[PDB]
Structures are given as C-alpha cells and as structure tokens.
Amino acid sequence: TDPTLEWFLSHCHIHKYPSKSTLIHQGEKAETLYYIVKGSVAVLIKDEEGKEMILFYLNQGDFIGELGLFEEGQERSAWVRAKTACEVAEISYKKFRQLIQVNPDILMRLSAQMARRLQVTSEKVGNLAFLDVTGRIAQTLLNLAKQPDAMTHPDGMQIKITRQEIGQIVGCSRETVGRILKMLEDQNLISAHGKTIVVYGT
Amino acid sequence: TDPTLEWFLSHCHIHKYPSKSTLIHQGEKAETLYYIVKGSVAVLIKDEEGKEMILFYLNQGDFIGELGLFEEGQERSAWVRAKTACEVAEISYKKFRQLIQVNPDILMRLSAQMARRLQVTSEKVGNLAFLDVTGRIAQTLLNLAKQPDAMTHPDGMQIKITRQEIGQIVGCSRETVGRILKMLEDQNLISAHGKTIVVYG
Numbered sequence: 560t561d562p563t564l565e566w567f568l569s570h571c572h573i574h575k576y577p578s579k580s581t582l583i584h585q586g587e588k589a590e591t592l593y594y595i596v597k598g599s600v601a602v603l604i605k606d607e608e609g610k611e612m613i614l615f616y617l618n619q620g621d622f623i624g625e626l627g628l629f630e631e632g633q634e635r636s637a638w639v640r641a642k643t644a645c646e647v648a649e650i651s652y653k654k655f656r657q658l659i660q661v662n663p664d665i666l667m668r669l670s671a672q673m674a675r676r677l678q679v680t681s682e683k684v685g686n687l688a689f690l691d692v693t694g695r696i697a698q699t700l701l702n703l704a705k706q707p708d709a710m711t712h713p714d715g716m717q718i719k720i721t722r723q724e725i726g727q728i729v730g731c732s733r734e735t736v737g738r739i740l741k742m743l744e745d746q747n748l749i750s751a752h753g754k755t756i757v758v759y760g761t
Numbered sequence: 762t763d764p765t766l767e768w769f770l771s772h773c774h775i776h777k778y779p780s781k782s783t784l785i786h787q788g789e790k791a792e793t794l795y796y797i798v799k800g801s802v803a804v805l806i807k808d809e810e811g812k813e814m815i816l817f818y819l820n821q822g823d824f825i826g827e828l829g830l831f832e833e834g835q836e837r838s839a840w841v842r843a844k845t846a847c848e849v850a851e852i853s854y855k856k857f858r859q860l861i862q863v864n865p866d867i868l869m870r871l872s873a874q875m876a877r878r879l880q881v882t883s884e885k886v887g888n889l890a891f892l893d894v895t896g897r898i899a900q901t902l903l904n905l906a907k908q909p910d911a912m913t914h915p916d917g918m919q920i921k922i923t924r925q926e927i928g929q930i931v932g933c934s935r936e937t938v939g940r941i942l943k944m945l946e947d948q949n950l951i952s953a954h955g956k957t958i959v960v961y962g
C-alpha cells in the first residue's frame with residue numbers, strides 16, 4: 560500500500576460533503592490544505608455577469624487549496640464545488656509545513672500535481688488564444704476521449720457529457736454547444752447518440 | 762544575502778545567453794533545472810501555424826524548466842527565449858533532488874513560484890474567456906504602465922512596446938493591435954508617440 564499517504568492522512572481531519580457542495584469559497588483567506596480521499600470536484604472561476612468557467616476537474620488522489628500554502632495572507636484563487644459526494648482530508652498549512660521537514664516527498668507529490676495543472680492550464684490558454692468556438696469544442700471532445708473514463712466504441716472513444724458542461728469548459732452557452740455538436744455530426748467527426756458522444760478516429 | 766540561495770547556486774553551473782537566444786525548446790527531454798541570476802526571459806507557446814503566445818515573463822530570481830522535475834521522461838512544455846542578455850544558473854534534476862532531501866526549503870521556494878504561476882495563468886484563462894480583444898489590450902496597457910520600467914510622463918505613464926508583442930500577449934494580429942490603439946487615441950485614453958505609448962492615468 561502507501562505508508563506515506565497513510566502517514567499523511569493520520570495528521571488530517573476527514574470530512575464528507577454531499578454532491579454540489581462548495582468546498583472552497585473564492586476570496587477567502589487560505590490557511591488550510593485539502594486532499595480528496597473519495598469523489599471528484601470541479602474548480603471554477605466566474606465572470607462579472609455570473610458566468611462560470613470550469614478550470615479543472617480533480618478526483619481521488621488530488622490535493623486542493625494548495626496555492627495559498629507558500630505565502631501568508633493569500634486568498635483562495637477559485638471556487639471548488641463537490642461534483643459527487645466527497646470524502647475530504649484537511650490539515651493546516653502550519654502543520655503541513657512541519658510534515659514537509661520530516662518527509663519532503665509529500666511536498667513533491669503536491670508540486671507534481673501543480674506542475675501537471677500548470678501544463679494543462681497553459682494548454683487551455685493556447686486553445687482560447689488560437690481557436691474559435693468550433694475548434695475549442697473539438698479539442699475538448701478529443702481530450703475527454705483521452706480520459707480513462709472514456710468507454711471503448713467500434714467507431715472511436717465514447718464519452719458521456721452534458722452540453723451545459725461542455726459550455727462551461729470552452730466558454731460558451733449550452734445552446735451554442737448543441738448547434739456545434741450537430742455540425743460535427745454532419746461533418747462525420749462525432750456521433751450524438753442520445754446520452755453519449757462517440758468521438759471518431761480517437 | 763541569502764544562505765539557502767547561495768547554498769543552492771554553489772551547486773549550479775552558470776551559463777550566459779545573449780539576447781534573443783532560446784534556453785529551452787518545447788519537446789526537449791527535461792533533465793535540467795534553471796535559475797535566472799540576471800536578465801529576463803519570455804515563456805511562450807506556438808500554434809500549428811506558427812502564431813506565438815506569451816505565457817509569462819520571468820526575471821532575476823525565477824527558476825525555469827521545473828515542470829519536468831517531478832516525473833521522469835517528461836518533455837519541455839514550452840519555449841523560453843532570452844528577452845535580454847542572461848546570466849543563468851543550471852543544475853541536473855538528479856543533483857537537485859538531493860538538495861531537496863538535505864534542505865526542503867529550496868523546494869518550498871521553487872513550489873512557491875509554481876503556485877503564483879498557476880494563479881496568474883488561471884487569471885489569464887479568465888482574461889481570454891471573458892474579454893474581447895479590445896478589453897485585453899486596455900488591461901494590458903494598464904498593467905504595463907504599472908510596471909517599474911514605466912517611465913514617468915506629464916500626461917500619465919509611458920511604456921515602450923511593439924504591436925507585435927502586444928498581439929503575442931493578448932492573442933491577435935499586429936494589424937488588430939494597431940486598429941484598437943487608434944481607437945484608444947480617439948477616445949483620448951492613450952497616445953502613440955512613436956515607439957512608446959503614453960497611458961493617460
């Protein structure tokens with residue numbers, strides 16, 4: 560098994576949250592670090608009109624609220640809401656700074672996740688800068704197809720995903736998502752089989 | 762004037778890069794960490810057609826090429842180009858991982874810069890998703906006029922930047938930048954005094 564996590568978790572409080580609950584309130588003062596024992600979450604930023612953007616999906620095995628760890632007086636950089644019911648560990652920054660001196664691997668794992676997040680977020684900047692809505696929705700589909708949650712299909716990878724949520728990822732209305740998907744079918748690039756979406760040539 | 766940082770540099774091998782040189786190409790196998798002693802660099806990504814986007818500006822006191830540190834077999838995720846002449850400290854991941862075990866403070870310092878970079882890059886995501894090109898150019902000029910290299914001017918603040926570099930930051934053609942600037946002058950919000958730009962306010 561993993562003694563390091565075990566060791567890490569023995570210094571945490573664990574708490575459970577129902578689906579759709581807000582784990583992190585943007586703007587708040589950061590003093591605590593979190594680790595997802597079970598579940599999945601969305602990280603998201605808002606427009607001044609209430610519009611929500613989904614930055615990132617995090618799951619079992621992810622730290623959360625780590626960005627304020629390295630400087631005192633930081634505030635949460637974004638919102639995090641419980642995608643499913645979650646089981647979440649919690650430890651203060653101070654205590655977590657102490658664990659680091661005993662075993663820096665826990666910091667390595669955390670920074671490993673920051674590095675990954677930075678790479679992917681950077682790619683998202685690129686999509687936003689270089690691609691129109693159509694292009695962005697295509698890359699979004701290709702990426703979801705590459706996920707392990709992607710069911711295998713004769714014609715390609717099969718994903719299940721809401722239009723609304725596709726909109727929150729690329730930054731457009733769900734109506735716009737729908738019209739674009741319908742065009743991608745016509746172009747014979749995907750299929751919209753009721754619930755799922757089959758991404759051809761994946 | 763910093764015990765840990767010197768301690769860190771003492772293990773580094775220094776290299777100098779002339780302006781406009783590329784320290785890191787995207788795709789390379791990551792096996793080295795960098796630290797900027799002097800100078801400034803641009804981190805950027807290219808598009809399949811060659812269009813360039815500036816992700817971040819890094820300066821004296823910034824690690825570079827740290828994203829490949831935590832997993833092996835990784836590849837450099839972007840290009841880093843010398844914006845000026847640079848004095849850069851360098852060290853292998855292998856030897857760097859040992860510095861961590863000896864003193865994890867050096868990791869905390871590294872990780873602290875990574876944290877900031879994620880916040881600012883997520884902010885950029887917001888910028889691009891919620892603001893039209895006009896919006897982004899305005900915001901950009903403001904941010905530039907709040908810089909320390911922002912010379913002072915009686916009408917406001919003055920900055921020196923090309924339209925090319927403005928489009929690389931906000932993601933538009935240099936012909937788009939020009940057109941938007943003309944409009945900002947029309948609104949008496951800036952002045953195109955040749956090379957430089959006066960930002961009223």
Ligand SMILES: Nc1ncnc2c1ncn2[C@@H]1O[C@@H]2COP(=O)(O)O[C@H]2[C@H]1O
Pocket residue numbers: 583589602614615622623624625626627634635636637638639676677680879883
């Ligand atoms: N671009 C991103 N990719 C992944 N996780 C993010 C991103 N932006 C913010 N987060 C997470 O959102 C959390 C909310 O507040 P913190 O800044 O405390 O810590 C944050 C990060 O863990």
Ligand SMILES: Nc1ncnc2c1ncn2[C@@H]1O[C@@H]2COP(=O)(O)O[C@H]2[C@H]1O
Pocket residue numbers: 609610611612722723724725726727728729730731732733734890891
């Ligand atoms: N630039 C944008 N234009 C429209 N909706 C956006 C934008 N950026 C983010 N969104 C969000 O994306 C969501 C997708 O579908 P909704 O109609 O539910 O509501 C949408 C908005 O909240």
Ligand SMILES: Nc1ncnc2c1ncn2[C@@H]1O[C@@H]2COP(=O)(O)O[C@H]2[C@H]1O
Pocket residue numbers: 677681785791804816817824825826827828829836837838839840841878882
């Ligand atoms: N969004 C970003 N903000 C700051 N620095 C970045 C960003 N994206 C990439 N870099 C730097 O670009 C470097 C090039 O390759 P690495 O992945 O080795 O390490 C990278 C980071 O140091």
Ligand SMILES: Nc1ncnc2c1ncn2[C@@H]1O[C@@H]2COP(=O)(O)O[C@H]2[C@H]1O
Pocket residue numbers: 688689811812813814924925926927928929930931932933934935936
């Ligand atoms: N979406 C974009 N459209 C056009 N140029 C872009 C875009 N995103 C980044 N760029 C870059 O921005 C640069 C600014 O001026 P150029 O026309 O010289 O070349 C441009 C491109 O390399």
